[PDB]
Amino acid sequence: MPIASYAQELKLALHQYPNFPSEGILFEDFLPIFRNPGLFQKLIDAFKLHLEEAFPEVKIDYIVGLESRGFLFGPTLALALGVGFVPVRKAGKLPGECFKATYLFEIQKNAIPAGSNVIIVDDIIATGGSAAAAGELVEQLEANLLEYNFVMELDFLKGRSKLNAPVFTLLN
Amino acid sequence: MPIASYAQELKLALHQYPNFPSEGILFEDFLPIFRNPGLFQKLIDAFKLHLEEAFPEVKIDYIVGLESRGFLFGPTLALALGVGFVPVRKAGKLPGECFKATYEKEYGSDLFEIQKNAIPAGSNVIIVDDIIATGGSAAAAGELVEQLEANLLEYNFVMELDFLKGRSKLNAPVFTLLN
Ligand SMILES: O=P(O)(O)OC[C@@H]1N[C@@H](COP(=O)(O)O)[C@@H](O)[C@H]1O
Ligand SMILES: O=P(O)(O)OC[C@@H]1N[C@@H](COP(=O)(O)O)[C@@H](O)[C@H]1O
Ligand SMILES: Nc1ncnc2[nH]cnc12
Numbered sequence: 502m503p504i505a506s507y508a509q510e511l512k513l514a515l516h517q518y519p520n521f522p523s524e525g526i527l528f529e530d531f532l533p534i535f536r537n538p539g540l541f542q543k544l545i546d547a548f549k550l551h552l553e554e555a556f557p558e559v560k561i562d563y564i565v566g567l568e569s570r571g572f573l574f575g576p577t578l579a580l581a582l583g584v585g586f587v588p589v590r591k592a593g594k595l596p597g598e599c600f601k602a603t604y605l606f607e608i609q610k611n612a613i614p615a616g617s618n619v620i621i622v623d624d625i626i627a628t629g630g631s632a633a634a635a636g637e638l639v640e641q642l643e644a645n646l647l648e649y650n651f652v653m654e655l656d657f658l659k660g661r662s663k664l665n666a667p668v669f670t671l672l673n
Numbered sequence: 674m675p676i677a678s679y680a681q682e683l684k685l686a687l688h689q690y691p692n693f694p695s696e697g698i699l700f701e702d703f704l705p706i707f708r709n710p711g712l713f714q715k716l717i718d719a720f721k722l723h724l725e726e727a728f729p730e731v732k733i734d735y736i737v738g739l740e741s742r743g744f745l746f747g748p749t750l751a752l753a754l755g756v757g758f759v760p761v762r763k764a765g766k767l768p769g770e771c772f773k774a775t776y777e778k779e780y781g782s783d784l785f786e787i788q789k790n791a792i793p794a795g796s797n798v799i800i801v802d803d804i805i806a807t808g809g810s811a812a813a814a815g816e817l818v819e820q821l822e823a824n825l826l827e828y829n830f831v832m833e834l835d836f837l838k839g840r841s842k843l844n845a846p847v848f849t850l851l852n
Contacts, residue, residue, distance in 0.1 A: 516768075516769070518768035518769055521769075522765065522768075528768045530768050530769070532759070532760065532767075532788070532791070535748055535751070535757065535758040535759070535760075536735070536757035536758065536792075537757060538751065538752055538754075538755050538756055538757060541748070541751070541752055541757075541758065542752060545752070563708070568741055569740055569744060572741060572745055573744055573758075574748065576707055576713070576746065576749055577748050579707070579710065580710055580713055580714060580717070580749055582710075583710050584710055585707065585708040585709060585710060585713075586707040586708065586713065587707070588704065588707075588745070595704075596688075596690035596693040596694075596702050597688070597690055597693075597702070609704065612704070612708060
């Protein structure tokens with residue numbers, strides 16, 4: 502499968518950092534994928550192929566990416582798909598009238614029309630709180646949340662239980 | 674020229690927000706470019722064309738993008754060029770051994786970082802960010818590229834606040850797409 506082979510090669514590119522940011526935490530650094538345009542293209546194509554597989558006759562209108570590491574691939578995935586990108590940002594970073602969701606995250610009220618089909622993207626799901634907030638913001642837009650797309654998922658934290666929409670994680 | 678037509682259309686897409694984040698500050702919101710894949714592609718192509726024009730027989734090895742709004746287009750520009758992307762992040766966000774460069778905001782001397790292993794010495798680099806204001810953040814990124822022993826070919830900005838004279842803090846040449 503094209504997705505599995507790319508998922509394996511991207512897994513190998515990850516760099517493990519014991520005890521960062523603090524004692525006990527194992528940091529999965531996906532940044533090495535972005536320094537190699539071959540690997541980066543594979544990550545984008547992997548997500549693209551999955552969305553083509555999951556949603557063959559459903560038009561995606563936007564990728565919604567979470568600040569800050571979702572910004573590293575979300576916009577690029579959006580452009581690969583030929584769709585818009587919209588950020589979900591931390592509190593007080595977006596100008597103009599915003600909707601708010603507590604975790605505080607925000608989205609711009611004018612960014613996405615009602616009835617738009619949306620995919621939320623982020624590097625990793627841990628507790629799920631940030632992703633859940635993004636979902637609340639998509640809901641306040643009256644937009645449709647087709648799926649959450651993550652690069653990594655910390656299964657032991659049970660982040661997906663806080664979420665309503667279906668979840669895809671590329672590297673399990 | 675293609676650059677200019679795209680620059681005009683991207684200028685029109687910007688949304689002005691008076692008195693954000695505080696009184697007196699005029700916020701230039703470039704986020705409307707990213708909601709429209711046509712506009713987004715034009716921004717990427719504009720930068721691509723400019724780098725092809727400025728550096729026709731010089732291989733760019735990396736785009737270095739500043740956190741957080743440089744992340745919105747830097748990686749995508751990197752992939753369009755067929756080159757690596759490396760982030761410059763705020764203090765304590767990058768794992769592993771990092772180089773450090775100081776910058777000041779208003780009531781604070783905060784800190785940027787880059788990963789020591791990210792870029793080899795002698796790599797040719799373009800630093801990218803949404804906007805240059807005081808120039809402090811861009812200057813810090815330059816100090817990090819220098820600690821890498823990498824070559825800073827150019828700074829590339831979407832917008833520039835000319836009245837702040839941010840350019841004067843920088844050593845390498847500067848390109849701003851929307852003047
Ligand atoms: O799943 P939760 O809400 O616990 O965390 C989500 C992650 N938090 C970010 C990293 O944490 P931060 O650097 O913002 O403190 C990741 O990029 C993901 O968005
Ligand atoms: O030119 P300076 O150093 O004054 O500012 C650079 C800008 N500051 C960021 C926004 O500032 P922040 O939202 O972190 O307060 C922009 O994306 C640019 O990087
Ligand atoms: N006027 C401004 N608009 C957008 N971003 C900024 N960063 C610093 N000053 C800014």
